[PDB]
Amino acid sequence: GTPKEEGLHFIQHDWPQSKVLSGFDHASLRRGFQVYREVCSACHSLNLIAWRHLVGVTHTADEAKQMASEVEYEDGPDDEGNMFKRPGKLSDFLPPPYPNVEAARASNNGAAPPDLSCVVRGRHGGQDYIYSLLTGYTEPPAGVEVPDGMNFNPFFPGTQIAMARPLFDDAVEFEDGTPATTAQAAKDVVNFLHWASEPELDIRKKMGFQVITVLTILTALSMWYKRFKWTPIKNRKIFYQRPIK
C-alpha cells in the first residue's frame, strides 16, 4: 500500500548469531535479561519462559533459585478449600504483570502489549526490525501531527505507535560495567528476545555441521560407486553383421 501505511523498510546489521559456526553472546544475553526485567517486566509479559531455562545459560542454579524465591505465586487448595500464596519455585514461569488481556487493555488506553515470547520470529525482519523500532523515535516532520496518546515512529506500520520511548540513556546499571546507552541496551534486549524465541539454536547448529559433513562424504562415495558399477554398459560395442539372404 501507501508508504505511510506500511512503514519504513528496516535497516540491516550483523549479529554474532547470524554466521554459520557461531552461537550466541551470553554476556549480552544476561545484560539483555537484566534490562528486560528492569524495564519491560512492568507491562510486557513473557509467560512462556521458566526460571529453569536460564539455569546454565545466563545464571547459575543458586542465583536462579534466589532470584525466583522473591516472587509470590498462587498455589492449589488447602486442606479446607482456600488458596494460599507461595514463595516461588524453580519450575514456575515468569510473572505476567496483568491477570488477563482486558486489564491490559483498560490500563494502556485501548492497546494490548503483545507477549514477547515469540515476537522476534513473528515479525517481518526480526532482530533488525525490533532494534530499529526501539532506536527509531524521532520528532515528526512538518505536515503530519500525532494525536494525544500516540507517538511518531516511521518503522511502525502507519507511523503511529502506542508506546512511549522505553529506553532512555542510563536506565539500567550493568553488572559488567558497560555504559547503558540507548544503542547498547537495545542491542542487548534484541539479543535476549531472539534467544527467548529460539533457545535451541546452539545445539542445532552444533549437530548440523557433523550431519552435513557425513552426508557430503557419503554422497561423494555414491557418485563414484555408481560409475564403478555402470561401466560395462556405458562402454558397450555393437556391430551389425548384415544378414545376406
Binding site: 554398459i233 556405458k234 558397450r236 555393437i238 551389425y240 548384415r242 544378414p243
Partner: protein, 122 residues
C-alpha cells in the same frame, strides 16, 4: 485419436508449397532426429493393433535394419552423444517406408467397419 496433418491441401496449391519449402527444411533440421542416424517412420508409436499388424508385414531386410538403427540410437542415447556429421541420415535414405502398409491396414479395417453398419432404404 490419430495423427492429423494438413499435408495435402497445401500440396494442392503449388505456390504454398514453394513458399513453405525453406521453413520445412529449417524445421526438419531443427527436429534433430537425423543426428541419431534414425528415420522418421521409426519414431511412430506402435502400441495399437494396426501398427502391430503392419510391423509384421514388412520385408525382413527392413525389419532387421530398423532393429539395428533403433539399438544403435539407444546405445548412443545411453552416453548422451551423437554420431559425427559424416554418419548422419542423408535425405535420400529418409523415405516413407511404413505409411503405405499402415494405410492398407486402415483401409481394410475401414471397409470392415463400413460393411458392419448398413441399412435398408426401400
Amino acid at each position: 485419436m490419430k495423427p492429423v496433418s494438413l499435408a495435402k491441401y497445401i500440396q494442392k496449391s503449388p505456390f504454398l508449397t514453394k513458399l513453405l519449402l525453406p521453413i520445412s527444411n529449417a524445421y526438419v533440421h531443427l527436429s534433430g532426429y537425423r543426428k541419431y542416424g534414425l528415420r522418421y517412420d521409426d519414431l511412430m508409436l506402435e502400441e495399437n493393433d494396426d501398427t502391430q499388424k503392419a510391423l509384421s508385414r514388412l520385408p525382413k531386410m527392413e525389419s532387421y535394419d530398423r532393429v539395428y538403427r533403433i539399438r544403435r540410437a539407444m546405445q548412443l542415447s545411453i552416453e548422451n552423444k551423437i554420431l559425427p556429421k559424416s554418419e548422419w541420415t542423408k535425405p535420400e535414405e529418409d523415405y516413407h517406408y511404413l505409411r503405405p502398409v499402415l494405410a492398407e491396414v486402415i483401409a481394410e479395417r475401414k471397409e470392415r467397419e463400413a460393411f458392419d453398419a448398413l441399412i435398408v432404404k426401400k
